[PDB]
Amino acid sequence: VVNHNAQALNTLVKQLSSKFGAISSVLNDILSRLDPPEAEVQIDRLIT
Amino acid sequence: VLSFELLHAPATVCGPKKSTNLVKNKCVNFNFNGLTGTGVLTKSNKKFL
Amino acid sequence: ILPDPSKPSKRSPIEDLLFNKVTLADAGFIKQYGDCLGDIAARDLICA
Amino acid sequence: YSVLYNFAPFFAFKCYGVSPTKLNDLCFTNVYADSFVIKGNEVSQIAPG
Structure with a gap:
């Protein structure tokens, strides 16, 4: 039970490093590198 | 054309x-x-190459 | 199976064995903020 | 990259990895510029994939 909870949490954290088809997996870099009209698409991909 | 590599390397420009x-x-x-972010910066005792 | 007065946690030897036989990565009641900043090698998975 | 605009009568300024508006703020590891002369109708041909 403990290992199941820990591994579920670990996979949840590791999902933050996936690009999800966007340019990058970190929000700050893409927000500072893309104009907001274009960055809407990448932020939306990260959101979903 | 202008090509850049936005990767984790010591920036030259x-x-x-x-x-x-x-x-x-x-x-x-x-x-x-360019490492935009927020946090508390404290000196570290790592072994950075 | 009865509590041991000598033990400070007031737990039976069997209870102590069971507690020591489970590796709780995140016990919860630790209030980890205060030691995450003070890391010498790398932040733990719990800290992340 | 403020000196970009006055150096040419721009016809196509499409950027893929980074918007040209917020281009001075970033830091690039290396910068490579490739120069060539191409025809008119083939400006779409010079593009990824």
Whole structure:
């Protein structure tokens, strides 16, 4: 039970490093590198 | 064409040179070579190559 | 199976064995903020 | 990259990895510029994939 909870949490954290088809997996870099009209698409991909 | 590599390497070109004196043990926003983010910066005892 | 007065946690030897036989990565009642900043090698998975 | 605009009568300024508006703020590891002369109708041909 403990290992199941820990591994579920670990996979949840590791999902933050996936690009999800966007340019990058970190929000700050893409927000500072893309104009907001274009960055809407990448932020939306990260959101979903 | 203009090609760049936005990857985790020591940046050689940095654009307009703006430097603010680094503070420690305080909640600040850091922009080290485009590494935008927020946090508390404390000196570390790692073994960076 | 009865509590041991000598033990400071007031737990039976069997209870102590069961507690020591489970590796709780995140016990919860630790209030980890205060030691995450003080890391010498790398932040733990719990800290992340 | 403020000196970009006055150096040419721009016809196509499409950027893929980074918007040209916020281009001075970033830091690039290396910068490579490739120069060539191409025809008119083939400006779409010079593009990824």
